[PDB]
Ligand SMILES: O=C(O)C[C@@H]1CCC[C@H]1C(=O)c1ccc(C(=O)O)cc1
């Protein structure tokens with residue numbers, strides 16, 4: 001196949017979707033075929049659609065979804081609230097493998113953080129990553145609290161020998177405060193910081209977003225993700 | 228010795244200090260001697276003093292600390308900015324062991340979440356819980372995001388055979404709301420929920436707060452800590 005990357009985060013609202021779109025665009029500009037896949041999407045009763053936003057910002061046409069639940073809640077709660085069940089483990093894995101092909105970067109965006117349940121019983125994105133031999137790109141914040149959350153996530157990735165492809169800061173303030181700078185430097189000491197997306201990256205239009213995306217990431221690391 | 232309990236949290240600002248004070252107050256109301264050790268304290272420029280809060284809210288007098296930094300940052304960054312190393316692993320472990328005595332509940336409060344650096348070099352509250360054979364109480368929020376953070380923190384505990392004394396929600400909202408109430412059930416499925424401190428409990432005066440604390444925890448669980 002090609003290269004599968006799960007895109008998780010330290011928590012919710014940390015920028016997984018905008019990092020997905022931003023990495024997708026940077027890879028597309030390097031001539032890499034990109035698919036983005038969102039096995040579990042909650043919050044549809046308020047218009048959340050990460051697949052839609054990713055296409056909107058990065059022009060990905062190859063967008064695969066699976067489970068959709070209305071309430072803006074954890075996959076497990078939003079399912080119970082809807083009278084619905086979670087997908088099964090081998091259904092998510094099937095969705096990804098069916099996208100996987102050589103020369104393609106397939107991004108699997110999670111729901112919330114790494115240990116959120118996506119399938120019964122206690123199946124997480126980390127388990128999926130094992131099942132499909134994917135590295136995890138961890139979306140982190142610059143805010144106070146990020147250092148503990150990142151260290152936890154990395155440990156949880158290592159506990160199952162899921163390789164960390166590095167961190168992305170979902171929102172980088174212009175200009176940075178004392179904490180923001182301190183965190184960025186400390187983050188860089190615990191893992192590679194693949195990029196620091198500028199604050200407001202998601203309000204950009206197509207071309208602004210594609211330029212931001214091309215600048216955000218090291219061209220040579222992006223190009224190196226897919227042979 | 229006695230019973231040592233580290234009080235940690237999923238993160239920062241989740242209610243670690245108020246929960247120490249609350250469990251200290253409930254344990255005091257059960258006739259338990261309570262000491263609270265806060266090795267490293269930051270944000271002192273703006274008035275942060277977690278041991279003072281425990282004193283005022285819970286009446287604890289055995290309040291033990293080693294270092295104070297003015298910058299409202301994680302200990303390693305406040306110390307970086309201040310130009311002075313964190314205390315030594317040895318100082319923290321020995322302070323806590325000296326605090327520990329039979330019949331006393333010794334609470335140990337970190338900074339931020341479980342895996343924050345507190346001592347030289349890269350020593351965490353997890354490492355300290357190991358060294359003094361302490362179990363961890365994990366403070367958590369009711370808010371969207373808490374489930375992943377709690378599951379992450381409990382894993383990090385298990386990975387070093389540090390026992391989990393349970394969860395406390397540091398601020399229970401009024402009224403709950405759908406996500407808070409769904410999280411409370413989910414958390415309870417993950418570990419024992421020992422208490423949910425009502426929002427605003429930190430602004431209580433001593434008598435009010437004591438009454439809250441007496442009522443927040445199970446009388447028998449608390450009494451059975453020593
Ligand atoms: O948690 C507290 O006790 C409040 C304190 C006050 C000053 C900054 C807070 C702190 O220590 C801290 C620890 C770790 C992290 C992090 O993981 O990035 C962030 C902040």
Ligand SMILES: O=C(O)C[C@@H]1CCC[C@H]1C(=O)c1ccc(C(=O)O)cc1
Nearest residue numbers: 012072073074111112372373374375
């Ligand atoms: O994808 C997101 O993170 C944004 C979505 C929007 C609404 C619910 C968010 C969600 O999925 C989620 C997942 C897990 C947890 C938790 O561990 O507590 C909280 C929220």
